Design a protein around this ligand. Structure first.
Ligand code: MG
Ligand code: MG
Ligand code: MG
Ligand code: MG
Ligand code: MG
Ligand code: MG
Ligand code: MG
Ligand code: MG
Ligand code: MG
Ligand code: MG
Ligand code: MG
Ligand code: MG
Ligand code: MG
Ligand code: MG
Ligand code: MG
Ligand code: MG
Ligand code: MG
Ligand code: MG
Ligand code: MG
Ligand code: MG
Ligand code: MG
Ligand code: MG
Ligand code: MG
Ligand code: MG
Ligand code: MG
Ligand code: MG
Ligand code: MG
Ligand code: MG
Ligand code: MG
Lengths: 114, 56, 120, 209, 121
RNA sequence: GAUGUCGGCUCAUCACAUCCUGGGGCUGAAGUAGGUCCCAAGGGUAUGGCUGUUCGCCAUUUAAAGUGGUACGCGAGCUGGGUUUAGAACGUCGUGAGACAGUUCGGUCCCUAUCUGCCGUGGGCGCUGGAGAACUGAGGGGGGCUGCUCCUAGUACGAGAGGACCGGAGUGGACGCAUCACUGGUGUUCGGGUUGUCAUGCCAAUGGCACUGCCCGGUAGCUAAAUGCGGAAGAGAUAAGUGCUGAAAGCAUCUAAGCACGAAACUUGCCCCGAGAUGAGUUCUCCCUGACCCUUUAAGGGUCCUGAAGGAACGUUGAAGACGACGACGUUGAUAGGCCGGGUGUGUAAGCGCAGCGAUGCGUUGAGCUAACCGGUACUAAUGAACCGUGAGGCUUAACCU
RNA sequence: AAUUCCUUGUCGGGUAAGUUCCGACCUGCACGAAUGGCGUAAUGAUGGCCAGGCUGUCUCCACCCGAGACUCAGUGAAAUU
RNA sequence: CACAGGUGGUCAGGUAGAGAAUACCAAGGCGCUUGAGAGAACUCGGGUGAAGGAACUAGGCAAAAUGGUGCCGUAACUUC
RNA sequence: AGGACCGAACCGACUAAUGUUGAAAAAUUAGCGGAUGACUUGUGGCUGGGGGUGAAAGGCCAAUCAAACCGGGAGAUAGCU
């Protein structure tokens, strides 16, 4: 247990910033491609969220070229590289699956602002 | 689904062998009172591990 | 398989184990002592203990939320205004359980859940 | 070679430079004090007994002390044989450790089990379930026919059907080592070995390459 | 992904609804996904095109609803099941533009013709 | 004085006249692949359309979709679609009642298992002093499948087209075992939202009932679609077959003497049960070293004093469990619950203030609340005892002693 | 065809694939005009077939909540033999 | 049988509602004459299910789903 | 207006499961049809066994029906067990 955790934190990164279930965020991951290897963006919007120490995910909704896509980022993985924060908003919810079936205008979310 | 042959008395007791019983295996005695009681739980009238938990 | 599960389901709903308990709960306060099934006792304890721990802090929240559990102000008063500070120092074990078991009807095991400082 | 007696408390990740996320099981080997090494001198053996934990000493039976004292006694949960071929070891508390492994990459691990209990087919034997409708009667998920007819006149031995499930040896084999970091006495393998956390389990280098 | 099932055309010539009729790969292969070859049967199809309703070609899954994942253990899922037609007897897509995103699990050379095609990943 | 029919389902077991994979002889065998025969039962051996169908035809797969026995395997295991009750109609036959090896629509499938047998699990006694452990391993079971791609080598072969052997690497299909770290499911014991209504005097805040009233999310645990691993290499003895040397039989000859190779079959290797292995095994450690009496007396019976090692019970309990069992702990304490702190999960409580006529919004406040989880903590419960087990262990002979 | 034996007749439609179904042909084994012939809107817990929606019917079962089953105390059967 | 069955007439409160539906309640009457534990397979009655969606099967059997009021708008055919 | 429409009471029984030594010698549960009419129900009356009654199933006529129940002919007869 405490042999673990010390094993966990031993790999936990402190780069990951503030996170709220509703923000836009922009994750950058090493594509690895073929001969090459860069960093691929993924501007999205949070819909579900991790919170399990070394073990954690993002679960983001995009709706890219044509239809929607979802991506649960194992955060603490090198592939994560760097994750932005972009637009933050108001949700009044923990998980936003009620966004699956929505489409523009109806999928619209509010802005946080204190 | 019934029997085909009336079971002998022998085979009966043979089954009741385990269907026996067990005694009290000796019981406890209280410190405060000379209560002859059942281990881990209250004497004839309020006493236990000494004390007097619950009068009367 | 029950592996690592908690809370005896007894023999009824999830509505019973939230009434026949909530009741016995106040019945504990209202009388300081009680005779019941060791199993039931070894449960009401998990009920009437987190309530006293809540008795520590007077407050308005700790009153209504203490009313949320048990519908007897008469006891939510004995709590906060008695057993509250009565155990204000108590580390947690606010109750002895005792035993005796064996009832007339059912060969059922009975106990004697009771407040520690029950010396009257 | 031989192995050491560890303990379960694993199940974790370990990201790689590239990007891979390796699963894991954290076996803890708290040294292995040889209890009564012995050669052909007594029995066709050639193994070496051990120990690892620490009984409260107040619990250890008197018998569970003599054999101990008749060597580098150091309490411990239990005792475990460890057959070897062409090798030495001092019958006196030698306490071998995870250093054992390093160049080692095989490993096997052999905890107790999982212990379900009931079992019953469909799970105890992956038995298929006969339609929960279109008729049926008290026979949805049941054995259904455990034999044939008069010719056989009986039910063959080994007939898969119900009966206690789990709670027994079950090894694993293979599993690449990730960390042999002592000082904490940790041994990180690929992933999932019987056990059930805290449960004792051997860890000998895979018989298979 | 298993017999029956309805996938979408991720390219062109024979629109929407297209039913899978056989999971290729081996005896009893349960379901397919990511980027495997699957026997398909056109169900709707556009009036024109080179392929029409009733046809029985084969196709490659491009966007399952379940998703994919590996390395980090991060899952990429979509909402719907994508497909892609290819001239039956000897590979490569019977089309021009491939609509929508894909996955790098398709960068397996022998499919390339598709990944080069513009939407994403 | 009743042995339930077909087809299906579930679950099988065997045979080999072998469908696939394995080893060979011949070929009208270049290769690639085929044909045929011999050897071979380890393992493996399709989903759908139609039909009650088995079967079959068709579609699309596969390494292949074997053949046959088992009351044409299996209804005190499921179905009841076909098939012989009673209704009704058609065609047809008969004057008619009715009938059809014609058809059509409808039409009650019982039994709580004593014995055998099985899958599990205990209680006795026994293994010759009593105990606590660790193993030997006679035996028993499990497992045994295979596609494709890259290399060799675009080489041998081939006029081309096409295209290997032998050996090597990797990745899958199906099957199995294990595990919740990941991705998810559930999660009526966590949180929130909400409709109707009854109630706690009323406001506010709450609770009960309505499938958990409806619903969104979710801890632990359980789990698969999730994750890791596995069926091998390698030995030995062979099958068909191939041979060496060689006589019978001046030659020839796999054989007669005598030697050599040779398969997923066989014995092993791999995993699990395993000394009731009554042939009841072995190793290590531990505990007991008082009197007396009565005999039918060398076989013993009883009393007084002792009661050990260890066990059993009892209690707190467990990722162990139907009950037994097995594991941990018992104040020499973390063994349960409570408690403290943390995490996780919901999602910003109540009270108060501000703004708004109001619904409501904002601040306080990522607040309030939170289990089965993690770390820690004797507050409560795990009592001193009492119970069982005894007190140096039969003979015979042999090896060392004396 | 509630009538057709041959029979899954033949052709067309529907399907990836259709001994059923719908439309035709006519060679009616053995339709046919009040033991009525051919139609027919509406109606039908009527027979057959198809599609959307829907789903644990199924691939392929997992978890959960309850009543039994299991343990304890009281009472206390049955067929059959 | 102190049996989940059968038995004709009368009375008819509050909130919600079209209502002698239904949900919750008044007055009033009851908790059904074995209980206590456990939290096994399997059976019965339910709730939730990733991806697929009739591939089930003799047959969509059973489930799942639809479901109210106002308005819009509504085909073949017809005995209008 | 209507053997009209949706739907409780009320009348009925199309499907399924559970029950099958039942809670029950035909029911319970979830559904299902009818619901101003050839509707439904209380009380009492009349039809009698080769007879009744029957919107017709050999259906009903007291858990009994191709000829009720009871008593009698009756110790029918039984080349059968
Ligand atoms: Mg617990
Ligand atoms: Mg009970
Ligand atoms: Mg409730
Ligand atoms: Mg039945
Ligand atoms: Mg026999
Ligand atoms: Mg042969
Ligand atoms: Mg077929
Ligand atoms: Mg169809
Ligand atoms: Mg048969
Ligand atoms: Mg039956
Ligand atoms: Mg039938
Ligand atoms: Mg008839
Ligand atoms: Mg005639
Ligand atoms: Mg026709
Ligand atoms: Mg006619
Ligand atoms: Mg005429
Ligand atoms: Mg009663
Ligand atoms: Mg589903
Ligand atoms: Mg079908
Ligand atoms: Mg089928
Ligand atoms: Mg239905
Ligand atoms: Mg329904
Ligand atoms: Mg009407
Ligand atoms: Mg009904
Ligand atoms: Mg009506
Ligand atoms: Mg009358
Ligand atoms: Mg009658
Ligand atoms: Mg006479
Ligand atoms: Mg007579």
């Amino acid at each position: 247990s405490n042999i673990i955790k010390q094993l966990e934190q031993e790999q936990m990164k402190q780069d990951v910033p503030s996170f709220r279930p509703g923000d836009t965020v922009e994750v950058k991951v090493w594509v690895v491609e073929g001969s090459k290897k860069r960093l691929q963006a993924f501007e999205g919007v949070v819909i579900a969220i991790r919170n399990r120490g070394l073990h954690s995910a993002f679960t983001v909704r995009k709706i890219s070229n044509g239809e929607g896509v979802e991506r649960v980022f194992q955060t603490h993985s090198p592939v994560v590289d760097s994750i932005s924060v972009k637009r933050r908003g108001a949700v009044r919810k923990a998980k936003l699956y009620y966004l699956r079936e929505r489409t523009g205008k109806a999928a619209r979310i509010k802005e946080r602002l204190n | 689904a019934v029997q085909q042959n009336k079971p002998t008395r022998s085979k009966r007791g043979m089954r009741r062998s385990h269907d026996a019983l067990t005694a009290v295996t000796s019981l406890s005695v209280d410190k405060t009172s000379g209560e002859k009681h059942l281990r881990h739980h209250i004497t004839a009238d309020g006493y236990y591990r000494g004390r007097k938990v619950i009068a009367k | 398989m029950r592996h690592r599960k908690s809370g005896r389901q007894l023999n009824r709903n999830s509505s019973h184990r939230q009434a026949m308990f909530r009741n016995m709960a106040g019945s504990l306060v209202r009388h300081e002592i009680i005779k019941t099934t060791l199993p039931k006792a070894k449960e009401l304890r998990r009920v009437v203990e987190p309530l006293i721990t809540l008795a520590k802090t007077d407050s308005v929240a700790n009153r209504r939320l203490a009313f949320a559990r048990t519908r007897d102000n008469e006891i939510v008063a004995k709590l906060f205004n008695e057993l509250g500070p009565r155990f204000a120092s108590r580390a947690g074990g606010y109750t002895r359980i005792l035993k005796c078991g064996f009832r007339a009807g059912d060969n059922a095991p009975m106990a004697y859940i009771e407040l520690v400082d029950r010396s009257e | 070679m031989i192995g050491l007696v560890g303990k379960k408390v694993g199940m974790t990740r370990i990201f790689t430079e590239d990007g891979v996320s390796i699963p894991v099981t954290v076996i803890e080997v708290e040294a292995n004090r040889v209890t009564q090494v012995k050669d052909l001198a007594n029995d066709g053996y050639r193994a070496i007994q051990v120990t690892t934990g620490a009984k409260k000493a107040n619990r250890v039976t008197k018998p569970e002390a003599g054999h101990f004292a008749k060597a580098g006694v150091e309490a411990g949960r239990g005792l475990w044989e460890f057959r070897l071929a062409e090798g030495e070891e001092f019958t006196v508390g030698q306490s071998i450790s995870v250093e054992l492994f390093a160049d080692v990459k095989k490993v096997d691990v052999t905890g107790t089990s999982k212990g379900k209990g009931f079992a019953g087919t469909v799970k105890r034997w992956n038995f298929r379930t006969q339609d929960a409708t279109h008729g049926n009667s008290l026979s949805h998920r049941v054995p259904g026919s455990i034999g044939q007819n008069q010719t056989p006149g009986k039910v063959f031995k080994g007939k898969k059907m119900a009966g206690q499930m789990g709670n027994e040896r079950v090894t694993v084999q293979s599993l690449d080592v990730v960390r042999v970091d002592a000082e904490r006495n940790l041994l990180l393998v690929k992933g999932a070995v019987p056990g059930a956390t805290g449960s004792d389990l051997i860890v000998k280098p895979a018989v298979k390459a | 992904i298993q017999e029956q099932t309805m996938l979408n055309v991720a390219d062109n010539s024979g629109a929407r609804r297209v039913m899978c009729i056989k999971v290729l790969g081996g005896s009893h292969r349960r379901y397919a996904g990511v980027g495997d070859i699957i026997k398909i049967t056109i169900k709707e199809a556009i009036p024109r095109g080179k392929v029409k309703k009733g046809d029985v070609l084969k196709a490659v899954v491009v966007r399952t609803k379940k998703g994919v994942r590996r390395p980090d253990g991060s899952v990429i899922r979509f909402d719907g099941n994508a497909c892609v037609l290819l001239n039956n007897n000897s590979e490569q897509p019977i089309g021009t533009r491939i609509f929508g995103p894909v996955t790098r699990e398709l960068r397996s050379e022998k499919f390339m013709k598709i990944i080069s095609l513009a939407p994403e990943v």
